[PDB]
Amino acid sequence: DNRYKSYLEGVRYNVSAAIGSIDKIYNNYKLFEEQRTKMYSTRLDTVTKDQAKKEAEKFTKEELEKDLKELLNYIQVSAKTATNFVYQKEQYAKQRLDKLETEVKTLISEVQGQSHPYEAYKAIVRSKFLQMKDSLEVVKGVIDRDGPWY
C-alpha cells in the first residue's frame, strides 16, 4: 500500500545516509593517516611537514564520535521501521540492520575509551567497521530494486 511505500522510502533514505557516513569516516581516516605520515616523515622539509600538521590537526575525536552517532541514528531508525519488512520481500534487511546497530554501538563505546584522535580512528576502523559498507549495500540492494534478484 501507500503506507508500505513510505516505509521503504524512509529506510532507503536512511541507509543511503548511513553509507555516506561510512564513506566519510573511512576517507577521513585515510587522509588523516596520509597527513600524519607526512608530518612525521624524515624525508620531508618543514614547510611540507607544517602543512601536513595543520591538515592532520583537523581530524578531531569529537568529529569522529559525532559521525558514528549520526551513523547509529540512521541505522537504528531504519531497523525499527524495518520490522514492517518481516514476512515481505525486503525481510532480509531487518536482521542485517539490527546487527549493524549492535556493531555501531560497539564502535561508539570504543571511541569514548580512547582519548586522542589517531588512536580512536585506529581502534574503530578494523574488521567489523570494514564490513559495514558491504552490509549496508546488501540492505540497499534488498530495499531498492529495479528488477529481479538475479
Numbering used by the authors: 222 to 371
Source paper text:
To better understand the observed differences in C1r recognition and inhibition properties, high-resolution X-ray crystallography structures were solved of the C1r-binding regions of B. miyamotoi FbpA and FbpB at 1.9Å and 2.1Å, respectively. The crystal structures presented here of FbpA-C and FbpB-C show that a defining feature of the C1r-binding domains for BBK32 and B. miyamotoi Fbps is a four-helix core with an extended second alpha helix that presents a functional arginine residue on a small surface-loop.
A structural overlay of FbpA-C, FbpB-Δ5C, and BBK32-C shows that the three proteins retain an overall similar structure around the conserved R248 residue (BBK32 numbering). However, we noted that the area near BBK32-K327 involves a minor structural alteration in FbpA-C and a more major alteration in FbpB-Δ5C. In FbpA-C, the kinked portion of alpha helix 5 extends one turn longer than in BBK32, resulting in FbpA-C containing an additional surface-exposed residue on this helix. Each of these key residues are conserved in FbpA (i.e., R264 and K343), whereas in FbpB, only the arginine is conserved (i.e., R309). SPR binding assays showed that FbpA-C and FbpB-C bound with high affinity to C1r-CCP2-SP with K D = 0.90 nM and 1.4 nM, respectively, whereas FbpA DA-C exhibited no detectable C1r-CCP2-SP binding. Interestingly, while FbpA-C was able to bind to both zymogen and active forms of C1r readily (C1r zymogen K D = 0.85 ± 0.036 nM, active C1r K D = 0.39 ± 0.049 nM), FbpB selectively interacted with active C1r only (active C1r K D= 1.1 ± 0.042 nM). B. miyamotoi FbpA conferred levels of resistance comparable to BBK32, while the FbpA DA strain was as sensitive to serum killing as the vector-only control.
